[PDB]
Amino acid sequence: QFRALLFDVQGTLTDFRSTLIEHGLSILGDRVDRELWEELVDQWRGCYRDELDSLVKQEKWRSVRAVYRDSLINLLAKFSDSFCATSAEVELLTDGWERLRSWPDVPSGLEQLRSKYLVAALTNADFSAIVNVGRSAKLQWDAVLSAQLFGAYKPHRSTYEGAATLLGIAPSEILMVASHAYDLEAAREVGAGTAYVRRPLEYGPTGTEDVPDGRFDFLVDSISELADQLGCPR
Amino acid sequence: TQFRALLFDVQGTLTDFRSTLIEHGLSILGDRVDRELWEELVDQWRGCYRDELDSLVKQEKWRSVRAVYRDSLINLLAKFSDSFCATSAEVELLTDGWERLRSWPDVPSGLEQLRSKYLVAALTNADFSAIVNVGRSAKLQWDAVLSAQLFGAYKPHRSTYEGAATLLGIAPSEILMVASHAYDLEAAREVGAGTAYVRRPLEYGPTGRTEDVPDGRFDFLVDSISELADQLGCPRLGGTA
């Protein structure tokens, strides 16, 4: 039995790619075509994950807003022949990562879980970003937790252990929920349960992690489906 | 248009802790204690907790507030040992009462009304797991939950308000602090926060002491969270917002 479900948010609960594609196209207009902007959004995510990987190996923490801003600036330099952005527009574009929309039925699935479980976010985004994403993605939590609180990013073990300490529960009483296998594996190393949510469109229409039945404790296509499997009414 | 977030004290400001713990203890202990006596211990319990936090603030130390509550209960049990007794298991159950606080009437809907215009967050000296639990017992839904435990310091230490502003990504002058205790508003304002005082005449019981708070001492002076929401121009619940 679990007392709390701890959720990855970007991708797991939110369509960040669609959000940032539409966000950037609305700000930039016909300065960019959809095909170019789609490619930059994919490279932007790659630079962010590359930087976080490097910071984790050094056991260091930076503002993730700064990570997104700096990588955008460097990508603008790479694509400078095709379009340009002002400094004010860099800030507005970077804001898009704090306006993520949820996958359909995520708000109702989250609400369904709360009859039996505490639900909390554990995200690498800054604390203020996940508060903002709560409004744009319509997510209501018992608690919001960020890498900023621990000075370390997932998958560092101090994030899961810090979350368990703050929540007053043992790591084995937390069910970690994510669409990324690395996160579940890291949480399980300290004892957490694991629930994998398939998100086939997380990275666009491309053709997926190798996740057979049994690799994780639960393997589902929606949060509502997980709530059903955990015995949550409705 | 001035504020981006409201930051709330919780115990007393939003919750009737005195009624909660009076009824909680009488249900655990039953006939072993009379209402008149248990009420007295509840008031003394709160006093010991406040005294211990005041001492830790001066030492700039932090410890689990559940432990503060538990240790002071054990010392009050010794003091009243001729009238009743409690097991170690019952000490844990009684100490749980501070995590089961019930809200004042209309607090949940006042809080929901504010969210049409503002981010709302708790800033409490209770441990993080305690305020999460109080959210269920008091029916409070937040944008964020913040605890002294995150900062290693209790209110009114400057680092709690500044830490909260840093985490929320907003300047202190864009935070409106909400409390029924003048000392909390005064400390938040020293960092730049706006101030909203909520009168709670029953916070300390039917004959509860009150503070001298005239018009103008704080930015807002109200009798309910819903009244505050109206003065900030939040639409009534049930509309498009």
Side-chain angles (χ1 to χ4, degrees):
Chain A
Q1 263 135 20
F2 303 107
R3 303 222 150 240
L5 269 58
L6 203 51
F7 287 83
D8 181 61
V9 178
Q10 184 179 124
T12 298
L13 302 180
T14 52
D15 187 356
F16 67 85
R17 194 183 187 261
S18 293
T19 300
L20 267 293
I21 287 166
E22 294 317 307
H23 182 74
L25 291 175
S26 151
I27 288 174
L28 293 174
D30 36 43
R31 254 186 284 183
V32 278
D33 45 88
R34 175 168 301 253
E35 233 178 48
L36 184 36
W37 184 242
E38 287 191 356
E39 178 65 28
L40 186 142
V41 168
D42 286 335
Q43 283 177 49
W44 199 359
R45 186 210 160 54
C47 302
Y48 157 86
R49 190 74 230 155
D50 283 348
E51 171 81 345
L52 253 61
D53 283 351
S54 169
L55 291 171
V56 166
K57 285 292 141 282
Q58 312 171 238
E59 305 180 306
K60 198 276 199 77
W61 176 92
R62 300 175 61 202
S63 166
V64 162
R65 170 153 192 107
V67 173
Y68 279 128
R69 173 190 298 115
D70 285 4
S71 49
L72 178 59
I73 288 174
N74 289 329
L75 284 170
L76 286 167
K78 181 188 177 177
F79 291 68
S80 56
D81 296 331
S82 316
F83 69 104
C84 66
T86 65
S87 292
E89 288 172 325
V90 167
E91 295 307 313
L92 298 172
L93 290 165
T94 295
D95 285 347
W97 294 102
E98 315 185 20
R99 295 185 165 169
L100 312 180
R101 294 157 226 153
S102 47
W103 298 108
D105 305 318
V106 159
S108 45
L110 212 56
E111 156 149 54
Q112 191 183 339
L113 292 160
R114 290 184 78 197
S115 57
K116 278 187 46 173
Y117 303 97
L118 302 169
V119 291
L122 177 68
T123 182
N124 280 337
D126 292 347
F127 197 92
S128 60
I130 174 60
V131 170
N132 283 329
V133 169
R135 295 300 188 104
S136 63
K138 302 172 181 44
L139 316 167
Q140 175 63 49
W141 303 105
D142 289 291
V144 165
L145 305 171
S146 158
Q148 181 170 13
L149 299 180
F150 311 110
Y153 306 109
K154 308 187 291 180
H156 198 280
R157 69 180 282 151
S158 63
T159 64
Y160 313 97
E161 300 204 297
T165 294
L166 289 178
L167 288 172
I169 64 196
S172 75
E173 309 189 286
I174 297 170
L175 178 56
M176 189 77 207
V177 184
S179 62
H180 315 109
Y182 90 90
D183 196 356
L184 299 183
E185 291 184 338
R188 184 166 56 196
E189 273 173 46
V190 308
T194 55
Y196 191 92
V197 188
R198 300 188 189 102
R199 292 301 191 195
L201 299 171
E202 177 169 357
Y203 303 111
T206 75
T208 278
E209 293 187 301
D210 191 339
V211 183
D213 272 326
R215 179 167 178 201
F216 300 112
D217 296 320
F218 303 86
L219 173 63
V220 299
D221 293 310
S222 77
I223 302 311
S224 315
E225 183 184 356
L226 180 61
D228 290 335
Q229 300 187 0
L230 290 169
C232 295
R234 307 185 35 66
Chain B
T1 42
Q2 159 72 44
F3 300 115
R4 291 172 104 211
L6 269 62
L7 199 58
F8 286 84
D9 182 61
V10 177
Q11 190 180 122
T13 298
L14 304 179
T15 52
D16 184 2
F17 69 90
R18 193 176 189 265
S19 298
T20 300
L21 282 94
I22 285 168
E23 302 302 322
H24 179 78
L26 293 180
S27 181
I28 288 166
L29 298 167
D31 290 322
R32 294 139 72 177
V33 65
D34 185 46
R35 178 179 291 275
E36 169 159 298
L37 180 60
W38 180 245
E39 285 189 358
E40 191 51 39
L41 186 147
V42 165
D43 288 341
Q44 292 189 29
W45 201 359
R46 181 46 131 78
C48 286
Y49 154 86
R50 274 261 40 99
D51 289 348
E52 171 72 359
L53 254 52
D54 281 348
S55 151
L56 291 157
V57 156
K58 272 112 202 183
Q59 313 179 248
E60 280 177 311
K61 284 233 243 173
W62 176 92
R63 60 190 283 238
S64 164
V65 160
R66 173 154 189 111
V68 169
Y69 278 129
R70 174 197 294 114
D71 290 1
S72 52
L73 179 65
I74 284 167
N75 273 106
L76 284 173
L77 285 180
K79 182 201 219 233
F80 296 83
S81 65
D82 291 341
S83 315
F84 73 92
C85 67
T87 59
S88 282
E90 286 173 333
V91 165
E92 293 311 310
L93 290 179
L94 291 162
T95 294
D96 284 352
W98 296 103
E99 314 186 17
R100 295 172 189 229
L101 310 182
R102 289 181 307 108
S103 47
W104 299 108
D106 304 309
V107 158
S109 65
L111 203 59
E112 189 189 339
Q113 186 185 348
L114 291 157
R115 293 184 80 200
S116 66
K117 246 185 109 163
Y118 303 98
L119 298 174
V120 296
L123 180 61
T124 183
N125 284 332
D127 291 347
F128 195 92
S129 61
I131 171 68
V132 167
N133 285 333
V134 167
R136 297 303 190 104
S137 62
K139 292 153 173 33
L140 314 173
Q141 326 262 299
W142 305 104
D143 292 290
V145 167
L146 306 169
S147 163
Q149 181 170 10
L150 299 173
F151 313 109
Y154 306 103
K155 306 186 299 184
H157 195 274
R158 189 184 189 96
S159 64
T160 60
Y161 311 97
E162 293 181 327
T166 295
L167 286 173
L168 293 171
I170 66 189
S173 61
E174 304 177 300
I175 296 171
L176 171 59
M177 189 80 202
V178 184
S180 60
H181 316 110
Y183 88 89
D184 197 359
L185 301 183
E186 285 186 347
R189 182 167 56 197
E190 284 181 35
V191 173
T195 52
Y197 191 89
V198 184
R199 301 184 190 103
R200 293 296 189 198
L202 299 181
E203 178 169 356
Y204 305 109
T207 61
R209 80 224 197 222
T210 60
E211 298 182 300
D212 183 355
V213 185
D215 284 347
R217 178 176 180 195
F218 301 111
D219 300 314
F220 303 86
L221 174 57
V222 298
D223 293 308
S224 73
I225 299 318
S226 321
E227 185 183 359
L228 179 62
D230 288 338
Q231 299 188 3
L232 294 163
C234 297
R236 60 167 67 75
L237 287 178
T240 52

